């Protein structure tokens, strides 16, 4: 789990997740009393804030998120020139393009899927007292958390679990669309495209119920002629070879 | 390819002297197409938009998302992605990408369990181009669909880190004068209430056994009590409810905690956030001093 | 007589829906300027120790 | 040849002790854990101890 | 011949030329990526497509591959990356190529990996531990080649032959040695690093 502290408040109270609705505070000191903790504390001691919320009317927990404000160079910089060493990928099914275009992403990054936290367990199958503590609830994550494969989900019995039997995981689930991906291309870069001294070689004809093998060229089969003579001119068969002009 | 002379033999093709045909677009064209971009951030849902499986008619029913696509997938909402757009032949061969801008979206998930169903809603992101300018450019270079494409970021970049519930944590007297422990896992999970009745509850015969105990959740308050009208909401036998809180004038700081030193505070001050990234992704198991904001 | 060996309690809180804030009320440890609201100390991944 | 110092500050220590048979007392408490050295690096007059 | 912006006379030569005064600085990145725990060392070279390229003129010192609190296993993988920060490349050429030589023991052949080639103009670059094609240890000594004056050649299958050639060796005389020797004013500072 991932643990951290709120900071003192400027005047050296405590800050505390505040109280929605203004009901269930902090418990309050007596006048002249200190926390046993801290001798040298202020008048009271704690701060705490209210968050007017009404959608919520039973027990909840305050579910926040590790907010980042300063990030340089998010994907390698804003240019042309950062985002063609970027690696891209699909996202949503191909549209038509009739008098408008109007795409939609539907694949993402991000899941909504029911997580349980076995926040606690036992320290051992033979001390008298242990106890254990899930938490089954909603959240986001990159990580397919539906993946679990173990059969000791959303059961009241709960006794045994432990990280060797509560929470298996399959990564292979969450898997992105990583075999067909593409990238930016530079218009202005010269890149050739013209081989005056090369020649393609396709597959046999199979002649068999499949594709026509002339029509796949893949330039898997080239060759390529000496430069300092010329380009290939013409290429012939005479009895059996092949000859190249 | 768009070759010069061809021979055959033994019913092979050779191809010679050929120039690798590339189309390409052009620059302008591109930064129109970025222009005349309309994205939005709407709340889309599946085909079937009704998950009648779940009920509150049950004791616990796992929200599973496997059964469909993989277009379950949605988007944070404080995130910043960078997108694009691609274009197809008329043979399915798909062009370039057109980077259109880093775009945040605005609209979380939104999960929403009625009686007898609930109702799942993703955000997606649509662009809208409208420029006929634009799209008879588009036509004219022999395009007919077009997908979108993103680029997802990278933990290094993520503007959120994890996403998880906040759990206060609990502390021995003793343990947090000698600084030994200061803070620690609380074994029972800790919630807040919304109201204030299950005081007015815990008085007389108004409590119900089967009805379960709320835990002492509240900043300073003893996992203890003295008083017997709220029994049940014991965790330690050894607790006298001693308050952390004395008078300097009075007693110093270890007489008054040798009163009770095996009692419990709890404290939301310091707090332990339970995400199921930090769980099932290994690289945020090792974080170290990490410069984060709540 | 009658005493201890074993005993264990098991508890799993189920929260069959979230809800969310308006961006108006977002509750957040930093706020520029505001004595108070004073920020996070620095984030501490726990493993076993 | 001696070069230099070593500015001792602080020192963790920690006890634990186990016992054979139970307590002599029927009602005794046992083994107590006290305060001994486990101060920050700041309080550096305690050092070497 | 169909360039018309010879300036120097080292443009004609096999082995490329470097222009402009490169300052590559590497920096650990740590949270992202997946390294073999080790040292691992960073080698750059330029190379024209289709052209010559320049002998390995920048390497970078050893940088760990450990955690942001404790070192690694000998069986550990760690999750690191580090970030490539270019400035004022040589913008003439088409491509700069990224090395990098990884160490697992002491002395040991390290495992060469051809991270990337990127373009001459980019400013940053984040080497996750994924990518990169093992290429042989031996060949890094093999980038640019040697100094050749031969006599006479020929061209054959798209193979090049030099034959009677002599292989230019340039030195540096005694006296000069010697003169660098006496004129070296050698002091011992206290230094730090950049973040101090």
């Given at each position: 789990?991932l643990?951290?502290?709120?900071?003192y408040?400027?005047?050296?109270?405590?800050?505390?997740?505040?109280?929605?609705?203004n009901?269930?505070?902090?418990?309050?000191?007596?006048?002249?009393?200190?926390?046993?903790?801290?001798?040298?504390?202020?008048?009271?001691?704690?701060?705490?804030?209210?968050?007017?919320?009404?959608?919520?009317?039973?027990?909840?927990?305050?579910?926040?998120?590790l907010?980042?404000?300063?990030v340089?160079?998010?994907?390698?910089g804003?240019?042309?020139?950062?985002?063609?060493?970027?690696?891209?990928l699909?996202?949503?099914?191909?549209?038509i393009?009739g008098?408008?275009?109007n795409?939609?992403?539907?694949?993402?990054?991000?899941?909504?899927?029911?997580?349980?936290?076995?926040?606690?367990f036992?320290?051992?199958?033979?001390?008298?007292?242990?106890?254990?503590?899930?938490?089954?609830?909603?959240?986001?994550?990159?990580?397919?958390?539906?993946?679990?494969?173990?059969?000791?989900?959303?059961?009241?019995?709960?006794?045994?679990?432990?990280?060797?039997?509560?929470?298996?995981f399959?990564?292979?689930?969450?898997?992105?669309?990583?075999?067909?991906?593409?990238?930016?291309?530079?218009?202005?870069?010269?890149?050739?495209?013209?081989?005056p001294?090369?020649?393609?070689?396709?597959?046999?004809?199979?002649?068999?119920?499949?594709?026509?093998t002339?029509?796949?060229?893949?330039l898997?089969?080239?060759?390529?002629?000496?430069?300092?003579?010329?380009?290939?001119?013409?290429?012939?068969?005479?009895?059996?070879?092949?000859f190249?002009? | 390819?768009?070759?010069?002379?061809?021979?055959?033999?033994?019913?092979?093709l050779?191809?010679?002297?050929?120039?690798?045909?590339?189309?390409?677009?052009?620059?302008?064209?591109?930064?129109?197409?970025?222009?005349?971009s309309?994205?939005?951030?709407?709340?889309?849902?599946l085909?079937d938009?009704?998950?009648?499986?779940?009920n509150?008619?049950?004791?616990?029913?796992?929200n599973?998302?496997?059964?469909?696509?993989?277009?379950?997938?949605?988007?944070?909402?404080?995130?910043i992605?960078?997108?694009?757009?691609?274009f197809?032949?008329?043979?399915?061969?798909?062009?370039?990408?057109?980077?259109?801008?880093?775009?945040?979206?605005?609209e979380?998930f939104?999960?929403?369990?009625?009686?007898?169903?609930?109702?799942?809603?993703?955000?997606?992101?649509?662009?809208?181009?409208?420029?006929?300018?634009?799209?008879?450019?588009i036509?004219n270079?022999?395009?007919?669909?077009?997908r979108?494409?993103?680029?997802?970021?990278?933990?290094?970049?993520r503007?959120?880190?994890?996403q998880?519930?906040?759990?206060?944590?609990?502390?021995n007297?003793?343990?947090?004068?000698?600084?030994?422990?200061?803070?620690?896992?609380?074994?029972?999970?800790?919630?807040?209430?919304?109201?204030?009745t299950?005081?007015?509850?815990?008085?007389?015969?108004n409590?119900?056994s089967?009805?379960?105990?709320?835990?002492?959740?509240?900043?300073?308050?003893?996992?203890?009590?003295?008083?017997?009208?709220?029994?049940?909401?014991?965790?330690?036998?050894?607790?006298?409810?001693?308050?952390?809180?004395?008078?300097?004038?009075?007693?110093?700081?270890?007489?008054?905690?040798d009163?009770?030193?095996?009692?419990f505070?709890?404290?939301?001050?310091?707090?332990?956030?339970?995400?199921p990234?930090?769980?099932?992704?290994?690289?945020?198991?090792?974080?170290?001093?990490?410069?984060?904001?709540? | 007589?009658?005493?201890?060996?074993?005993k264990?309690?098991?508890?799993?809180?189920?929260?069959?829906?979230?809800?969310?804030?308006?961006?108006?009320?977002?509750?957040?440890?930093?706020?520029?300027?505001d004595?108070?609201?004073?920020?996070?100390?620095?984030?501490?991944?726990?493993t076993?120790? | 040849?001696?070069?230099?110092?070593?500015?001792?500050?602080?020192?963790?220590?920690?006890?634990?002790?186990?016992?054979s048979?139970?307590?002599?007392?029927?009602?005794?408490?046992?083994?107590?854990?006290?305060?001994?050295?486990?101060?920050?690096?700041?309080?550096?007059?305690?050092g070497?101890? | 011949?169909?360039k018309?912006?010879?300036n120097n006379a080292?443009d004609?030569?096999?082995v490329?030329t470097?222009?402009?005064?490169?300052?590559?600085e590497v920096?650990?990145?740590?949270?992202?990526?997946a390294?073999?725990?080790?040292?691992?060392?960073?080698?750059?070279?330029?190379?024209?497509?289709?052209?010559?390229?320049?002998?390995?003129?920048?390497?970078?010192?050893?940088?760990?591959?450990?955690?942001?609190?404790?070192?690694?296993?000998?069986?550990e993988?760690?999750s690191?990356?580090?970030?490539?920060?270019?400035?004022?490349?040589?913008?003439?050429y088409?491509?700069?190529?990224?090395?990098?030589?990884?160490?697992?023991?002491?002395d040991?052949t390290?495992?060469?990996?051809?991270?990337?080639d990127?373009?001459?103009?980019?400013?940053?670059?984040?080497?996750?531990?994924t990518?990169?094609?093992?290429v042989?240890?031996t060949?890094?000594?093999?980038v640019?080649?040697?100094?050749?004056?031969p006599?006479?050649?020929?061209?054959?299958?798209?193979?090049?032959?030099?034959?009677?050639?002599?292989?230019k060796?340039?030195?540096?005389?005694?006296?000069?040695?010697?003169?660098?020797?006496?004129?070296?004013?050698?002091?011992?500072?206290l230094?730090?690093?950049?973040?101090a």
């Amino acid at each position: 789990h991932l643990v951290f502290a709120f900071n003192y408040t400027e005047s050296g109270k405590q800050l505390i997740l505040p109280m929605k609705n203004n009901n269930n505070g902090y418990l309050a000191p007596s006048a002249n009393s200190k926390p046993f903790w801290n001798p040298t504390a202020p008048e009271g001691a704690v701060y705490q804030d209210s968050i007017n919320f009404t959608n919520e009317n039973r027990a909840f927990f305050w579910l926040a998120e590790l907010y980042r404000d300063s990030v340089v160079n998010r994907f390698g910089g804003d240019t042309e020139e950062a985002i063609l060493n970027n690696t891209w990928l699909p996202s949503g099914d191909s549209v038509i393009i009739g008098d408008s275009i109007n795409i939609e992403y539907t694949e993402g990054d991000t899941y909504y899927q029911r997580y349980d936290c076995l926040r606690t367990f036992a320290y051992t199958n033979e001390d008298q007292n242990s106890i254990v503590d899930i938490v089954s609830f909603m959240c986001e994550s990159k990580v397919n958390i539906d993946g679990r494969y173990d059969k000791n989900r959303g059961q009241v019995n709960n006794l045994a679990v432990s990280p060797t039997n509560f929470n298996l995981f399959n990564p292979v689930y969450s898997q992105k669309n990583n075999f067909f991906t593409f990238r930016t291309i530079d218009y202005e870069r010269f890149s050739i495209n013209y081989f005056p001294n090369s020649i393609t070689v396709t597959k046999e004809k199979s002649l068999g119920e499949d594709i026509d093998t002339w029509t796949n060229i893949t330039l898997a089969t080239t060759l390529d002629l000496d430069g300092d003579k010329g380009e290939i001119v013409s290429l012939n068969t005479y009895n059996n070879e092949i000859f190249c002009f | 390819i768009a070759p010069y002379t061809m021979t055959q033999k033994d019913n092979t093709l050779f191809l010679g002297n050929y120039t690798l045909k590339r189309s390409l677009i052009s620059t302008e064209l591109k930064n129109q197409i970025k222009s005349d971009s309309i994205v939005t951030t709407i709340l889309g849902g599946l085909d079937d938009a009704i998950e009648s499986e779940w009920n509150v008619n049950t004791q616990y029913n796992s929200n599973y998302d496997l059964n469909y696509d993989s277009r379950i997938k949605g988007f944070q909402k404080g995130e910043i992605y960078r997108l694009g757009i691609q274009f197809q032949d008329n043979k399915g061969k798909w062009s370039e990408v057109v980077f259109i801008g880093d775009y945040e979206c605005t609209e979380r998930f939104k999960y929403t369990q009625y009686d007898t169903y609930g109702i799942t809603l993703i955000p997606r992101f649509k662009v809208v181009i409208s420029n006929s300018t634009t799209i008879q450019a588009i036509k004219n270079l022999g395009y007919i669909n077009a997908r979108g494409v993103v680029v997802f970021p990278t933990l290094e970049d993520r503007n959120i880190l994890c996403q998880g519930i906040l759990c206060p944590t609990v502390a021995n007297y003793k343990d947090r004068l000698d600084n030994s422990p200061f803070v620690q896992s609380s074994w029972f999970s800790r919630p807040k209430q919304a109201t204030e009745t299950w005081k007015t509850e815990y008085s007389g015969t108004n409590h119900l056994s089967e009805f379960g105990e709320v835990p002492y959740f509240q900043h300073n308050e003893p996992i203890g009590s003295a008083s017997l009208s709220e029994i049940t909401r014991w965790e330690i036998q050894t607790s006298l409810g001693l308050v952390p809180y004395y008078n300097p004038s009075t007693t110093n700081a270890k007489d008054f905690v040798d009163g009770s030193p095996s009692e419990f505070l709890v404290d939301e001050n310091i707090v332990t956030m339970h995400s199921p990234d930090v769980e099932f992704d290994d690289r945020l198991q090792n974080i170290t001093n990490g410069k984060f904001k709540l | 007589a009658a005493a201890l060996q074993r005993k264990i309690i098991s508890n799993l809180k189920f929260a069959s829906q979230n809800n969310y804030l308006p961006n108006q009320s977002v509750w957040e440890a930093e706020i520029s300027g505001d004595a108070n609201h004073t920020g996070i100390t620095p984030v501490n991944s726990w493993t076993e120790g | 040849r001696i070069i230099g110092t070593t500015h001792l500050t602080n020192t963790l220590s920690d006890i634990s002790v186990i016992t054979s048979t139970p307590t002599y007392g029927n009602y005794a408490t046992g083994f107590y854990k006290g305060k001994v050295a486990n101060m920050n690096i700041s309080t550096s007059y305690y050092g070497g101890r | 011949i169909t360039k018309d912006d010879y300036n120097n006379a080292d443009d004609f030569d096999f082995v490329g030329t470097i222009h402009t005064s490169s300052k590559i600085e590497v920096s650990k990145v740590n949270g992202s990526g997946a390294f073999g725990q080790g040292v691992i060392q960073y080698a750059f070279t330029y190379y024209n497509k289709y052209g010559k390229e320049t002998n390995i003129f920048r390497t970078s010192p050893l940088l760990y591959i450990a955690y942001s609190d404790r070192g690694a296993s000998p069986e550990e993988t760690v999750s690191c990356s580090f970030q490539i920060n270019f400035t004022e490349l040589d913008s003439s050429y088409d491509f700069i190529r990224v090395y990098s030589i990884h160490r697992t023991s002491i002395d040991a052949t390290p495992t060469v990996r051809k991270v990337a080639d990127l373009a001459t103009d980019t400013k940053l670059y984040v080497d996750t531990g994924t990518t990169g094609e093992i290429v042989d240890p031996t060949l890094l000594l093999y980038v640019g080649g040697e100094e050749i004056a031969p006599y006479t050649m020929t061209q054959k299958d798209n193979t090049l032959f030099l034959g009677n050639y002599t292989l230019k060796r340039s030195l540096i005389s005694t006296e000069l040695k010697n003169q660098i020797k006496s004129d070296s004013i050698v002091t011992t500072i206290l230094g730090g690093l950049d973040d101090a």
